[PDB]
Design a protein around this ligand. Structure first.
Ligand SMILES: *C(=O)/C=C/N[C@@H](C(=O)O)C(C)(C)S(=O)O
Length: 269
């Protein structure tokens, strides 16, 4: 069975794997360690952008945020490029999702909750969606670095998939805001070797990845069948076995996603 297959992925990559695919009308939930905690890493950036979208008119996307080289304390490919001229809130959302820019995320946290109030306000957004489990406690890059077992800055596959479901396939956001979030995730540049690699080309995939220390590699996606049937897929992993500098394994994620896609695509008439 599928649990046994997921277990064999864990043995082969010397990793811990978490999977959740919510139940639908026609399919049972897929759950593997689904209530175990894993570090968010950059996956929180998706609901962060929704938080900012939700709380503000679309005109707030035009607001120019200025920052300095001193505020760049994490890998920030887009923020580095715009450091002299600043970035709009809209540009920051784009950067945060599509490049996993760490400075962009920190600046959106300040915008949501003020300095020192951002991680609490982000977690409160999750609470506002009925997620009592997830918590963010630090900003970038510290949130990627807590040890195995620390509950800070964690979610569960179950919790983050149900949030993403609300955001993309529910009514947590009005249509016009919902469309921006979905466009950004659709245009993501960092996920080609993860959930995307597991689904056939005629399935549509949107995603947000995360990567961190202790071999952490995550991806959260929404996928659409060739006839437009939607599913939410969360895959989380770590490799605590090799300590802080353990190599993350994207191919573990691609494999877990391929197992999911088999169950989702394979009909039985
Ligand atoms: C989102 O998950 C961002 C993660 N960043 C880390 C990474 O592995 O990409 C580091 C190493 C850059 S962390 O920012 O110091």
């Amino acid at each position: 069975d599928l649990a046994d297959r997921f277990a064999e992925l864990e043995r082969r990559y010397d990793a811990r794997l978490g999977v959740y695919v919510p139940a639908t009308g026609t399919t049972a939930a897929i759950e593997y360690r689904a209530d175990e905690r894993f570090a968010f890493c950059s996956t929180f950036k998706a609901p962060l952008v929704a938080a900012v979208l939700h709380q503000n008119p679309l005109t707030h996307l035009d607001k120019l945020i200025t920052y300095t080289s001193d505020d760049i304390r994490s890998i920030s490919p887009v923020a580095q490029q715009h450091v002299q001229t600043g970035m709009t809130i809209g540009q920051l959302c784009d950067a945060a999702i599509r490049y996993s820019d760490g400075t962009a995320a920190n600046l959106l946290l300040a915008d949501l909750g003020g300095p020192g109030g951002g991680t609490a306000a982000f977690t409160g957004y999750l609470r506002s969606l009925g997620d009592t489990v997830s918590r963010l406690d630090a900003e970038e890059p510290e949130l990627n670095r807590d040890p195995p077992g620390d509950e800070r800055d964690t979610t569960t596959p179950h919790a983050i998939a149900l949030v993403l479901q609300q955001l993309v396939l529910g009514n947590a956001l009005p249509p016009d805001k919902r469309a921006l979030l979905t466009d950004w995730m659709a245009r993501n540049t960092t996920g080609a070797k993860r959930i995307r690699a597991g689904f056939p080309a005629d399935w549509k995939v949107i995603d947000k990845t995360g990567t961190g220390d202790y071999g952490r590699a995550n991806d959260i996606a929404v996928v659409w069948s060739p006839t437009g049937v939607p599913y939410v897929v969360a895959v989380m992993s770590d490799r605590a076995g090799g300590g802080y500098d353990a190599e993350p394994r994207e191919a573990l994620l691609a494999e877990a996603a391929t197992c999911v896609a088999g169950v989702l695509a394979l009909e039985h008439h």
